[PDB]
Amino acid sequence: SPTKAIVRLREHINLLSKKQSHLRTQITNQENEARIFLTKGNKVMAKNALKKKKTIEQLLSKVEGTMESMEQQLFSIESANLNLETMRAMQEGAKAMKTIHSGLDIDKVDETMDEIREQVELGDE
């Protein structure tokens, strides 16, 4: 059903947003590791922590790309649900507009109407 798909996009999105949260802390700690490495004058291990900081940032990027893909899929489902809610409402309204137009067991009117049309409409070809 559309709603099982809905709940699941939300569960996966929620999960990703704290992957996001965890990664950012990890980026913050690589930043702090490289600084401490410089305070011992080890520029190389400070450079290495910076390279590792960059890989975590790329991973974060791809975590946010997954989230966004899921959020747009979610919007499309709920937008399509509202559109279906409209169509069913119009289909039920047209049936109701038909009962009202057939609201005369008596008499004769609507095909008296339909060939007064043909006289008026006859001015066209």
From Swiss-Prot:
Highest taxon of the lineage: Eukaryota
Residues bearing the modification Phosphoserine: S102
Phenotype when changing A80K: Leads to severe sorting defects
GO CC terms: cytoplasm; cytoplasmic side of plasma membrane; cytosol; ESCRT III complex; multivesicular body; nuclear envelope; plasma membrane
Places the protein is found: Cytoplasm; Endosome membrane; Nucleus envelope
Single GO molecular function: identical protein binding
Keyword Methyltransferase set for record: no
This protein's record includes keyword Ubl conjugation: yes
Outcome of swapping E85K: Leads to severe sorting defects
Listed transmembrane segments: none
Keyword annotations: Cytoplasm, Endosome, Isopeptide bond, Membrane, Nucleus, Phosphoprotein, Protein transport, Transport, Ubl conjugation
Effect of H12E: Leads to severe sorting defects
UniProt topology in membrane: Peripheral membrane protein
Disruption phenotype: Exhibits defects in the sorting and processing of native vacuolar proteins.
PTM-bearing positions, type Phosphothreonine: T55
Effect of L82K: Leads to severe sorting defects
GO process annotations (BP): ATP export; intralumenal vesicle formation; late endosome to vacuole transport; late endosome to vacuole transport via multivesicular body sorting pathway; peroxisome organization; protein transport; reticulophagy; ubiquitin-dependent protein catabolic process via the multivesicular body sorting pathway
Note, other: Present with 3270 molecules/cell in log phase SD medium.
Subunit structure: Core component of the ESCRT-III complex (endosomal sorting required for transport complex III). ESCRT-III appears to be sequentially assembled as a flat lattice on the endosome membrane and forms a transient 450 kDa complex that contains DID4, oligomerized SNF7, VPS20 and VPS24. SNF7 polymerizes into spirals at the surface of lipid bilayers. SNF7 polymerization is nucleated by association of SNF7 with VPS20; the process is terminated through association of VPS24, possibly by capping the SNF7 filament. Interacts with VTA1; the interaction requires DID2. Interacts with BRO1.
Membership in a protein family: Belongs to the SNF7 family.
Function: Acts a component of the ESCRT-III complex required for the sorting and concentration of proteins resulting in the entry of these proteins into the invaginating vesicles of the multivesicular body (MVB). The sequential action of ESCRT-0, -I, and -II together with the ordered assembly of ESCRT-III links membrane invagination to cargo sorting. Membrane scission in the neck of the growing vesicle releases mature, cargo-laden ILVs into the lumen.
Record remark: domains: The N-terminus (residues 1 to 11) forms an amphipathic helix which is required for the association to membrane.
Protein name in UniProt: Vacuolar-sorting protein SNF7
